[PDB]
């Protein structure tokens, strides 16, 4: 057969290929020294996807036959718990399969050197519960609400000129968020114009349809009907039937019948005063005619998700069958009109009462880059909800790293012979991420690592690379702050990924051709 089956040292290289390949390219994106990258791929590949964001490109692609699909995969779950914030752990955990190669000349039991990731685990539980990462935001907090670590995530990111302000204003959408509501109804979206302000912040919920083009401009104090039960009329759940007549005149009476559903419709919607009426879903005509005639504006098939919201937002309802108007809902008043927007026409729910959920309506010039924003938007939301979350975080800009390398040192030697050895590169390992952040900054590496690691040894915890400074500097005036998650969850998933390459001996595979 065709089958590829690896065993012991080349079964180990096809791991220790994967590992390179990834940190170049991953290296160079990091924090505010990071660079975006285009791919364009054939099909099924439209044309280049430029991603600030490391992630989403992992996650896209599994493109050869070396492994590591799964390696990538991983990294998503830690983003869902946080991030991001930015892309760091895969680069470390490649460098750790480093060692290995001298683990060759360690040439003793290779698993026995796996007391590495019990050393990990030693080194990523002490950090935790040990140290400290963030004290006060006194909330929903003046100052301390933003540029920050929106920025440093934001920072390896392209959007920053324009977007270190986007990313600013997430934490004015983290503070509305604020409370035991969980994560919902916030919605997001980007424009095609121009304005230096790039983006807004609406009140209530952006929506785009229009009821009829027929019916009117704008409502005022909007009594808000949502429908489960779109318009639609006729059939049931027995056809019954395609039909015929004992005389024309029978047919008379099913014409009648659809009025009753209008009039059913027109008489409780006055009574409301109806201003608007949002259909998830398509919507019988006759209330078309009787709506645009209203001083009503329905919404056919305004589809759900932002009506959720937007039940989160006005007060709402149930809705519920046309019995539905009134205290079964519950309408909110603000002002719903539709309006332009450049260019495209959208209907703005606002002055909602709730004020529980809100919206960013970007504004850009327009492109995939603007779909960056789309790239961007995403990784904004995640680290505010964690950074809120976790009421801990670190110092970054290489701080976090370059005190644990000091400390880990320590810990090969607390260990004993053959764990010192394990436990001392796991140490050493450290000591990259010191080089990588420097190296995007364009000062020289060598030089970098010998202050730094003096003036964090010092315990001026604080104290981490400072691009700008072009040397060290204190993170804290910057506010590069990472998340106590990021931190835990990227030792406890490196060590178990790593061990799981070198665990395994023999790699078994069928050719696909």
């Known amino acids: 057969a065709g089958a590829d089956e690896e065993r012991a040292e080349t079964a180990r290289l096809s791991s220790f290929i994967g590992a390179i390949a990834i940190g170049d ?175 807004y912040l609406d009140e209530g919920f952006l929506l785009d349809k229009k009821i009829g083009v027929n019916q009117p401009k704008r409502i005022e104090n909007a009594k808000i009907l949502i429908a489960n039960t779109g318009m639609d009329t006729d059939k049931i759940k027995i056809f019954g039937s395609r039909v015929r007549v004992d005389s024309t005149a029978k047919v008379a009476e099913i014409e009648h019948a659809e009025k009753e559903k209008m009039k059913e419709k027109v008489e409780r919607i006055l009574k409301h005063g109806i201003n608007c009426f949002i259909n998830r879903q398509l919507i019988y005509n006759y209330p078309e005619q009787l709506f645009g005639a209203a001083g009503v504006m329905a919404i056919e098939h305004a589809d759900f998700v932002g009506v959720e919201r937007l039940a989160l937002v006005t007060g709402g309802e149930i809705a519920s069958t046309f019995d539905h108007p009134e205290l079964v809902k519950l309408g909110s008043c603000k002002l719903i009109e539709e309006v332009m927007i450049g260019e495209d026409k959208l209907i703005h729910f606002s002055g909602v009462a709730l004020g529980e959920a809100c919206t960013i309506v970007l504004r850009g010039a327009t492109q995939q880059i603007l779909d960056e924003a789309e790239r961007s938007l995403h990784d904004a939301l995640c680290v505010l909800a964690q950074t809120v979350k976790d ?91 990472e998340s106590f998650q990021v931190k835990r969850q990227v030792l406890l998933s490196a060590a178990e990924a790593a061990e799981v390459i070198l665990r395994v001996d023999n790699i078994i595979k069928a050719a696909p051709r």
């Not at 934001?154 to 509501?181: M, Q």
């Not at 880990?408 to 050895?421: D, N, W």
């Not at 952040?437 to 001026?460: M, T």
Request: aromatic fraction near 2%.
């Open 25 to 199: 390219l991953v290296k160079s994106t990091l924090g505010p020294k990071g660079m975006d990258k285009i791919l364009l791929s054939s099909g099924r590949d439209a044309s280049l996807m430029v991603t600030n964001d490391g992630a989403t490109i992992l996650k896209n692609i599994g493109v050869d036959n070396p492994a590591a699909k799964v390696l990538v995969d991983m990294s998503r779950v830690q983003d869902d718990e946080v991030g991001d914030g930015t892309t760091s752990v895969t680069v470390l955990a490649a460098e750790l399969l480093r060692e290995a190669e001298s683990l060759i000349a360690k040439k003793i039991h290779p698993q026995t050197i796996i007391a590495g990731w019990r050393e990990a685990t030693k080194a990523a539980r002490q950090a935790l519960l040990n140290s400290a990462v963030d004290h006060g935001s006194d909330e929903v907090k003046f100052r301390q609400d933003l540029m920050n670590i929106a920025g440093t995530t934001l920072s390896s990111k392209l959007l920053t000129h324009h977007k270190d302000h986007f990313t600013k204003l997430a934490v004015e959408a983290v503070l509305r968020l604020k409370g035991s509501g969980n994560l919902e109804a916030i919605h997001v979206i980007k424009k095609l114009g121009g304005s230096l302000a790039d983006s």
């Open 391 to 481: 009421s801990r975080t670190v110092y970054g800009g290489g701080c976090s790293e370059m005190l644990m390398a000091h400390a880990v040192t320590q810990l090969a030697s607390r260990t004993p012979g053959k764990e010192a050895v394990a436990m001392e590169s796991y140490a050493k390992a450290l000591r990259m991420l010191p080089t990588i952040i420097a190296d995007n900054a364009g000062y020289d590496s060598a030089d970098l690592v010998a202050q730094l690691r003096a003036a964090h040894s010092e315990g001026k915890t604080t104290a981490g690379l400072d691009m700008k400074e072009g040397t060290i500097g204190d993170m804290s005036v910057l506010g590069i702050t």
